[PDB]
Design an enzyme around this catalytic site. Structure first.
Site, PDB file in Angstrom:
ATOM      1  N   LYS A 181       0.814  -1.246   0.000  1.00 45.43           N
ATOM      2  CA  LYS A 181       0.000   0.000   0.000  1.00 45.43           C
ATOM      3  C   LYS A 181       0.842   1.289   0.000  1.00 45.43           C
ATOM      4  O   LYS A 181       0.353   2.348  -0.399  1.00 45.43           O
ATOM      5  CB  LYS A 181      -0.982   0.002   1.163  1.00 45.43           C
ATOM      6  CG  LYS A 181      -2.196  -0.911   0.944  1.00 45.43           C
ATOM      7  CD  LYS A 181      -2.686  -0.852  -0.501  1.00 45.43           C
ATOM      8  CE  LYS A 181      -4.078  -1.433  -0.695  1.00 45.43           C
ATOM      9  NZ  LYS A 181      -4.070  -2.653   0.118  1.00 45.43           N
ATOM     10  N   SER A 200      -3.017 -12.884   3.520  1.00 47.08           N
ATOM     11  CA  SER A 200      -3.359 -12.772   2.112  1.00 47.08           C
ATOM     12  C   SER A 200      -2.190 -13.276   1.259  1.00 47.08           C
ATOM     13  O   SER A 200      -2.424 -13.679   0.137  1.00 47.08           O
ATOM     14  CB  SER A 200      -3.742 -11.324   1.664  1.00 47.08           C
ATOM     15  OG  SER A 200      -2.573 -10.505   1.651  1.00 47.08           O
TER      16      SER A 200
HETATM   17  C1  LIG Z   1     -13.828  -6.405   3.888  1.00 46.79           C
HETATM   18  N1  LIG Z   1     -13.911  -5.081   3.204  1.00 46.79           N
HETATM   19  C2  LIG Z   1     -15.038  -4.361   2.948  1.00 46.79           C
HETATM   20  O1  LIG Z   1     -16.188  -4.799   3.285  1.00 46.79           O
HETATM   21  C3  LIG Z   1     -14.924  -3.141   2.287  1.00 46.79           C
HETATM   22  C4  LIG Z   1     -15.982  -2.162   1.900  1.00 46.79           C
HETATM   23  C5  LIG Z   1     -15.767  -0.876   1.171  1.00 46.79           C
HETATM   24  C6  LIG Z   1     -14.644  -0.051   1.336  1.00 46.79           C
HETATM   25  C7  LIG Z   1     -14.531   1.135   0.595  1.00 46.79           C
HETATM   26  C8  LIG Z   1     -15.524   1.508  -0.326  1.00 46.79           C
HETATM   27  C9  LIG Z   1     -16.641   0.680  -0.498  1.00 46.79           C
HETATM   28  C10 LIG Z   1     -16.759  -0.504   0.256  1.00 46.79           C
HETATM   29  O2  LIG Z   1     -17.834  -1.354   0.114  1.00 46.79           O
HETATM   30  C11 LIG Z   1     -19.190  -0.934  -0.018  1.00 46.79           C
HETATM   31  C12 LIG Z   1     -19.759  -1.699  -1.192  1.00 46.79           C
HETATM   32  O3  LIG Z   1     -20.149  -2.843  -1.041  1.00 46.79           O
HETATM   33  O4  LIG Z   1     -19.832  -1.154  -2.404  1.00 46.79           O
HETATM   34  S1  LIG Z   1     -13.290  -2.882   2.019  1.00 46.79           S
HETATM   35  C13 LIG Z   1     -12.866  -4.366   2.732  1.00 46.79           C
HETATM   36  N2  LIG Z   1     -11.592  -4.840   2.826  1.00 46.79           N
HETATM   37  C14 LIG Z   1     -10.517  -4.149   2.387  1.00 46.79           C
HETATM   38  C15 LIG Z   1      -9.729  -4.548   1.294  1.00 46.79           C
HETATM   39  C16 LIG Z   1      -8.637  -3.738   0.919  1.00 46.79           C
HETATM   40  C17 LIG Z   1      -8.345  -2.572   1.644  1.00 46.79           C
HETATM   41  C18 LIG Z   1      -9.154  -2.178   2.725  1.00 46.79           C
HETATM   42  C19 LIG Z   1      -8.921  -0.949   3.604  1.00 46.79           C
HETATM   43  O5  LIG Z   1      -9.810  -0.709   4.584  1.00 46.79           O
HETATM   44  O6  LIG Z   1      -7.921  -0.225   3.520  1.00 46.79           O
HETATM   45  C20 LIG Z   1     -10.221  -2.982   3.088  1.00 46.79           C
HETATM   46  C1  LIG Z   2      -4.130  -4.051  -0.610  1.00 45.45           C
HETATM   47  C2  LIG Z   2      -3.809  -5.405  -0.182  1.00 45.45           C
HETATM   48  C3  LIG Z   2      -4.026  -6.552  -1.103  1.00 45.45           C
HETATM   49  C4  LIG Z   2      -4.589  -6.377  -2.487  1.00 45.45           C
HETATM   50  O1  LIG Z   2      -3.833  -5.461  -3.327  1.00 45.45           O
HETATM   51  P1  LIG Z   2      -4.719  -4.576  -4.356  1.00 45.45           P
HETATM   52  O2  LIG Z   2      -3.666  -3.978  -5.291  1.00 45.45           O
HETATM   53  O3  LIG Z   2      -5.528  -3.661  -3.413  1.00 45.45           O
HETATM   54  O4  LIG Z   2      -5.679  -5.486  -5.096  1.00 45.45           O
HETATM   55  C5  LIG Z   2      -3.726  -7.830  -0.605  1.00 45.45           C
HETATM   56  N1  LIG Z   2      -3.256  -8.034   0.658  1.00 45.45           N
HETATM   57  C6  LIG Z   2      -3.014  -7.064   1.558  1.00 45.45           C
HETATM   58  C7  LIG Z   2      -2.478  -7.383   2.918  1.00 45.45           C
HETATM   59  C8  LIG Z   2      -3.287  -5.643   1.174  1.00 45.45           C
HETATM   60  O5  LIG Z   2      -3.040  -4.630   2.049  1.00 45.45           O
END
Ligand SMILES: CN1C(=O)/C(=C/c2ccccc2OCC(=O)O)S/C1=N\c1cccc(C(=O)O)c1
Ligand SMILES: *Cc1c(COP(=O)(O)O)cnc(C)c1O
Ligand SMILES: CN1C(=O)/C(=C/c2ccccc2OCC(=O)O)S/C1=N\c1cccc(C(=O)O)c1
Ligand SMILES: *Cc1c(COP(=O)(O)O)cnc(C)c1O
Lengths: 300, 300
Positions: free
Chosen positions: A44, A266
C-alpha cells in the site's frame, strides 16, 4: 551519491525470491515478489505515495488541505507514513473495533483517528468520511478503490519491476484482489508486452464476489472487499481462484517456517493459488510470479 | 534475471535517507542508514546470516547440529529467520519476562524457546545456554558478542554500502554500540580508506560503560550491553556520546512524525548524538552518516 531526499523515494523496487520448500507438486517455477520490503511493510506504500503525488501534480492539494480516508488496513498505515514525510495532516476513519496496536501505529506516524460505531463496521467509517468531506472543504479523500493513480503506479513501478527482474520471462502472475490495482496495473503493462502472459486473481472462498458469489465475512485481510472494485479491470483477469481461510493460514505459516518469509494471511492465500496453478502439467517449466502483499508480524 | 535463491540473499544493501526536519541547529548534512529495510527489520539480519555462513564455511555445522543463542533482542529474530530459511533447528534462551508478542514472533519462524527465571534476567539466559551447550554436543552457539564474523560482515557489506552510497564523501559515522560490530566493521574499512573519517559511539547515559561508568538498567534496547564487548575495537572509536532515555525517545518520536521514519528507541539515541555532532561549527558542510538499527513497530 545514492541518498534519498525522503522516505517516499524509497518506496517500491521490491525483490523476487524463489520458493524452495513450499512447492509441493509444482512443475512450474514459483517466485514471490516481496511487497514487505516497502518502508512500512506493505504494498500500500505504493498507492499512498502515488495517490498523493497525483493530487499534487493536479493542483488539488491547497495550503489548508487535510488528507482523509476511511481505512481498516494497510492503506491507512501507508497514508499516515506518506503524510508524515510530506508534513500533511492525516485523518483516518475506522470502526472502534480496530485494535489498540493498530491505533498506536497510526498515531505513531501522527495520524488522527476518528473511531466510528463498531456495529456499523466499514460502511460507518465510509459514511463518516463522506459526511466530513461533504461539510468541510479542506478534506481531500484519496479514494483507494476508485483512484486511477492506484493502477497507474502499478503500471509504472510493480509491472516494470516484474518485467525487468524476470528478463521478460514471467508467464503467469498470481495476485490477491483487494482494490484490484496490483493485478490490473501489472496486467495492463505485461499482457500488452507479452500477450501469452496470464493473470490469476485470488479471492476468499468465504466471500467469492468476483466468482459471482455473495459477500461474507472472512479473515483474509486486504483481499475480498465484497464488491467489484471500479479500479479492477476484469477483462485482463484470465482466471479466479478462491481460497479457504484454513489453507491461506496454513500456507502463510509454512512460508514463515520453511522459507523464512513471515508474511500476512493474504500472502498465504496468493501462494495457495500459485501452488495450484503450478501443479498443472500444461504449466511445466513456466515462471509464476506470485505477489506477497505484506509482513506477517502485524498479524501477531 | 534478478531473483534471490532464498531470503538470506536479500539481507543488507540498505538505503541512505537525508534528514529534513529533525535537524535543529545542524550545520552538517545528516543522512540516515535505514537498517529496518532488512528482511526482518533490523541490522541483526546481517550477523544472523554471517555467523551461520562463517560456521558453514568452517565445517562447524554437522547433520545433527542445533543452533543455540541466549538473546532478548533482534539477534534472536534474525537467527530464527535465517534458521528457518536454512532449515536448521533453532533454540533460543531468554528470561520468562519476554513479552508474549516476542515469543509468538520467534515461534512464527519455528524457533524453540527456553524461558529462564525472570529474576535472573540475561545472566540466567546465558547460564542456561552455557549448560545446554556443555552437556549436549549438538548445540552450536554463535556468540554474537565474540564472533569475528559480526564485525567481518560489517566490513564487507555495511561499510562498503556507506562508502559507495556517499561516493567516499562520508566524514563522520555515528552508531549505537550493542555488540560493537557495526561501528567496528565500518570504522575498520572506512578509517583506513579515508583516515580523516571519524567515528562516534553512542551509549545510554543510564549505563555509561564505554565512558568509564557503571552498568545500570535502561530502556534503549540494542545498545548499552553493560560491559565492553570483545568484538568492539575501542581504538577506532573517536568519541563517545551518552544519551538520556527521554531524549532518545523524544527524537525517535520526531523521526516518525516528522520524517515518516518509524524507528526503534536506539535509532532515536543515535540521532540525538548525530544532531549534537552536527551543531559543531568545525563540522560545517561535513556529511554525517547515522545508523538507524531497527523498525519502531516492534516497540508498540
Ligand atoms: C472487507 N472489506 C469491505 O467490506 C470493504 C468495503 C468498502 C470499502 C470502501 C468503499 C466501499 C466498500 O464497500 C461498499 C460496497 O459494497 O460497495 S473494504 C474491505 N476490505 C478491504 C480490502 C482492501 C483494503 C481495505 C482498507 O480498509 O484499507 C479494506
Ligand atoms: C491491498 C492489499 C491486497 C490487495 O492489493 P490490491 O492492489 O488492493 O488489489 C492484498 N493483501 C493485503 C495485505 C493488502 O493490504
Ligand atoms: C542489557 N544487556 C545486557 O545486560 C547484556 C549481557 C550479556 C549478554 C551476552 C553476554 C554477556 C553479557 O553480559 C555479562 C557481562 O557483564 O560480561 S546484553 C544486553 N543488551 C543487549 C544488547 C545487544 C543485543 C542483545 C541481545 O540479547 O540480543 C542484548
Ligand atoms: C544490535 C543493535 C544495536 C547495536 O548494533 P551493534 O552492531 O550490536 O553494536 C543497536 N540497536 C538495536 C535495536 C540493535 O538490535
Amino acid at each position: 551519491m545514492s541518498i534519498a531526499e525522503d522516505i517516499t523515494q524509497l518506496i517500491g523496487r521490491t525483490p523476487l525470491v524463489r520458493l524452495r520448500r513450499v512447492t509441493d507438486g509444482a512443475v512450474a517455477d514459483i517466485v514471490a515478489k516481496l511487497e514487505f520490503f516497502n518502508p512500512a511493510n506493505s504494498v500500500k506504500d505504493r498507492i499512498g505515495v502515488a495517490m498523493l503525488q497525483a493530487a499534487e501534480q493536479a493542483g488539488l492539494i491547497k495550503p489548508d488541505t487535510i488528507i482523509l480516508e476511511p481505512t481498516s488496513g494497510n492503506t491507512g498505515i501507508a497514508l499516515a507514513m506518506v503524510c508524515a514525510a510530506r508534513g500533511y495532516r492525516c485523518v483516518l476513519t475506522m470502526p472502534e473495533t480496530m485494535s489498540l496496536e493498530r491505533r498506536m501505529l497510526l498515531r505513531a506516524y501522527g495520524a488522527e483517528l476518528i473511531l466510528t460505531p463498531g456495529a456499523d463496521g466499514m460502511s460507518g467509517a465510509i459514511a463518516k468520511a463522506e459526511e466530513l468531506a461533504k461539510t468541510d472543504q479542506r478534506y481531500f479523500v484519496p479514494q483507494q478503490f476508485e483512484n486511477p493513480a492506484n493502477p497507474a503506479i502499478h503500471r509504472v513501478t510493480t509491472a516494470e519491476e516484474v518485467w525487468r527482474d524476470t528478463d521478460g520471462k514471467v508467464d503467469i502472475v498470481v495476485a490477491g484482489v483487494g482494490t484490484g490495482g496490483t493485478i490490473t496495473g501489472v496486467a495492463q503493462v505485461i499482457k500488452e508486452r507479452k500477450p501469452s502472459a496470464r493473470f490469476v486473481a485470488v479471492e476468499p472462498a468465504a466471500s467469492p464476489v468476483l466468482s459471482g458469489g455473495q459477500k461474507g465475512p472472512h479473515p483474509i485481510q486486504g483481499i475480498g472487499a465484497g464488491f467489484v472494485p471500479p479500479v479492477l479491470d476484469q477483462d485482463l483477469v484470465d482466471e479466479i481462484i478462491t481460497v479457504g481461510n484454513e489453507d491461506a493460514l496454513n500456507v502463510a505459516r509454512r512460508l514463515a517456517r520453511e522459507e523464512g518469509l513471515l508474511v500476512g494471511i493474504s500472502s498465504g492465500a496468493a501462494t495457495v493459488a500459485a501452488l495450484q496453478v503450478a501443479r498443472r502439467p500444461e504449466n511445466a517449466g513456466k515462471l509464476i510470479v506470485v505477489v506477497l502483499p505484506d509482513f506477517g508480524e502485524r498479524y501477531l
